[PDB]
C-alpha cells in the first residue's frame, strides 16, 4: 500500500515516535515524576499471610476454655477450647503497554524499565480501592465497605468531637478497639477546624494515625476506622513482567478495524500481571462517618 | 484505675482529663479488664500496694 503516515490506533494507547503532524520525538528528555508514587494502604494497615496456592484456609481459636474453683477433694470439671474456619482466594491484576519499535529504537530505549514502578503504583491503588471502598469492580466480594454496609455499623453527622469519638466508641462496643483512620486529604480542613483532637504534626486523630487514600471515591465528609489488624492479605505471585515482540492483542484496533498484530506491524507490549488476595478477619471491626 | 474499654469514650469526651496514648486518666495508669461483669458506667480506683497475692502452686 507505500502509506507512510503513522498508523492511528483506537484507544489509542500505543506510544509512537512520529506524530500525526510529522513531528519526530528524537532528543526525547525522559519524562521526570512530579510526586512520590503511592505504596499500597491494604499492605500498610493489614496483615500479610504467606500464601503458595491461590486460596488459603485459616483456623482461628474462638472459644477459651474456662477454669473452675475447686474444694479440696472436690471434683475438677471439664471445659472446650474452640476454633473457628475461614478461607481467601487470590485474583489476577494484569495490564499491557504497546509500543512502536520505532519509539522504543530512537525516542525512549529504557521505557519498560521506567515503567515498572508505575505499573506497580496502578496495582496498589487498583487492590486499596477493590478492598477497602469495594470501587472499581472488585472481585473479592469481601470489603470493608461492604462489612460496614452488612453491619450497618455507620454514623450519619458533621465532623465533631462528639461523633468522631462515637465513631471511635462504636467499633469498642465490641470489645474491638480502633487501629488507624482511613481519611481523603480534602477532608483535613474539617478534621482541623474542630475542637484539638487532631493535629497535622503527626498526622494523627485522636493519637490514632490518619492514612490518606489517593483516590476518588472516598467523598469529602466520609471517615473511616477500624482495628486493621482485622484486614489479612496475601500475595501468591510477585508482579511478572513478560516482553513480547510477536502476540496479537484484541483490545486495540487499528484505523480499519482489525486487531493489532506485533510481528506485521513491528511493535512490542510488555504484559504485566500479580495475584493477590485479601481476607476481612472480622466484619464487625470497622465503622464510617458519613454526611447527613 | 480499672476501667471497661466499653468507657473510654466516657472519659474521652470530658473536659483534657483523659489520653489514650499513655492510657491515663488524670496522670495515673488506666487498666482495662477483659470481662463482662464490669458495666459501662462504672469506674474503681486504689492505692493497689494494698493488694497481695501469693502462689504456692505454679500451674
Same mark, same amino acid.
Given at each position: 500500500? &507505500?502509506?507512510?503516515?503513522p498508523?492511528?490506533?483506537?484507544?489509542?494507547?500505543?506510544? $509512537?515516535?512520529?506524530?500525526?503532524? %510529522?513531528?519526530? $520525538?528524537?532528543?526525547?528528555?525522559?519524562?521526570?515524576? *512530579?510526586?512520590?508514587?503511592?505504596?499500597?494502604? @491494604?499492605?500498610?494497615?493489614?496483615?500479610?499471610?504467606?500464601?503458595?496456592?491461590?486460596?488459603?484456609?485459616?483456623? +482461628?481459636?474462638?472459644?477459651?476454655?474456662?477454669?473452675?474453683?475447686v474444694?479440696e477433694?472436690?471434683?475438677?470439671?471439664?471445659?472446650?477450647?474452640?476454633?473457628?474456619?475461614?478461607?481467601?482466594?487470590?485474583?489476577?491484576?494484569?495490564?499491557?503497554?504497546?509500543? !512502536?519499535?520505532? +519509539?522504543?529504537?530512537?525516542?525512549?530505549s529504557?521505557?519498560?524499565?521506567?515503567?515498572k514502578?508505575?505499573?506497580?503504583?496502578?496495582?496498589?491503588?487498583?487492590?486499596?480501592?477493590?478492598?477497602? /471502598?469495594? *470501587? %472499581?469492580?472488585?472481585?473479592? =466480594?469481601?470489603?470493608?465497605?461492604?462489612?460496614?454496609?452488612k453491619?450497618?455499623?455507620? @454514623?450519619?453527622? #458533621?465532623?465533631?468531637?462528639?461523633?468522631?469519638?462515637?465513631?471511635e466508641?462504636?467499633?469498642? #462496643? #465490641?470489645?474491638?478497639?480502633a487501629?488507624?483512620?482511613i481519611?481523603?486529604t480534602?477532608?483535613?480542613?474539617?478534621l482541623?477546624? @474542630?475542637?484539638?483532637?487532631? #493535629?497535622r504534626?503527626?498526622?494523627? /486523630?485522636? =493519637?490514632?494515625?490518619?492514612?490518606?487514600?489517593?483516590?476518588?471515591n472516598?467523598?469529602? =465528609?466520609?471517615?473511616?476506622?477500624?482495628?486493621?489488624?482485622?484486614?489479612?492479605? =496475601?500475595?501468591?505471585q510477585?508482579?511478572?513482567?513478560?516482553?513480547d515482540? !510477536?502476540?496479537?492483542?484484541?483490545t486495540?484496533? &487499528?484505523?480499519? %478495524?482489525?486487531?493489532?498484530?506485533?510481528?506485521? *506491524?513491528?511493535?512490542?507490549?510488555?504484559?504485566?500481571? $500479580?495475584?493477590?488476595?485479601?481476607h476481612?478477619?472480622?466484619?464487625?471491626?470497622?465503622?464510617?462517618?458519613?454526611?447527613?
Amino acid at each position: 500500500s &507505500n502509506n507512510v503516515k503513522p498508523q492511528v490506533f483506537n484507544p489509542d494507547n500505543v506510544m $509512537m515516535h512520529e506524530k500525526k503532524d %510529522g513531528t519526530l $520525538m528524537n532528543e526525547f528528555t525522559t519524562p521526570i515524576l *512530579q510526586e512520590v508514587m503511592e505504596n499500597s494502604k @491494604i499492605m500498610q494497615l493489614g496483615k500479610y499471610e504467606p500464601m503458595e496456592g491461590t486460596e488459603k484456609k485459616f483456623t +482461628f481459636w474462638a472459644d477459651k476454655p474456662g477454669a473452675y474453683w475447686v474444694g479440696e477433694g472436690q471434683k475438677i470439671e471439664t471445659s472446650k477450647a474452640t476454633w473457628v474456619n475461614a478461607t481467601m482466594r487470590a485474583f489476577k491484576l494484569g495490564v499491557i503497554l504497546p509500543v !512502536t519499535k520505532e +519509539f522504543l529504537n530512537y525516542t525512549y530505549s529504557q521505557f519498560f524499565e521506567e515503567m515498572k514502578p508505575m505499573i506497580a503504583e496502578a496495582f496498589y491503588k487498583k487492590f486499596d480501592e477493590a478492598g477497602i /471502598l469495594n *470501587q %472499581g469492580n472488585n472481585p473479592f =466480594g469481601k470489603s470493608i465497605a461492604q462489612s460496614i454496609e452488612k453491619t450497618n455499623k455507620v @454514623i450519619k453527622g #458533621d465532623f465533631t468531637q462528639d461523633n468522631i469519638i462515637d465513631l471511635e466508641a462504636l467499633l469498642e #462496643d #465490641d470489645e474491638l478497639e480502633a487501629n488507624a483512620f482511613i481519611s481523603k486529604t480534602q477532608n483535613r480542613s474539617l478534621l482541623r477546624k @474542630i475542637v484539638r483532637i487532631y #493535629d497535622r504534626n503527626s498526622d494523627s /486523630l485522636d =493519637g490514632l494515625p490518619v492514612v490518606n487514600l489517593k483516590s476518588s471515591n472516598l467523598k469529602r =465528609g466520609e471517615l473511616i476506622t477500624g482495628d486493621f489488624d482485622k484486614l489479612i492479605y =496475601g500475595i501468591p505471585q510477585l508482579i511478572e513482567y513478560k516482553i513480547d515482540e !510477536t502476540a496479537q492483542l484484541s483490545t486495540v484496533k &487499528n484505523e480499519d %478495524g482489525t486487531p493489532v498484530n506485533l510481528f506485521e *506491524q513491528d511493535m512490542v507490549a510488555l504484559r504485566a500481571t $500479580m495475584h493477590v488476595a485479601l481476607h476481612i478477619a472480622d466484619d464487625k471491626a470497622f465503622a464510617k462517618l458519613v454526611p447527613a
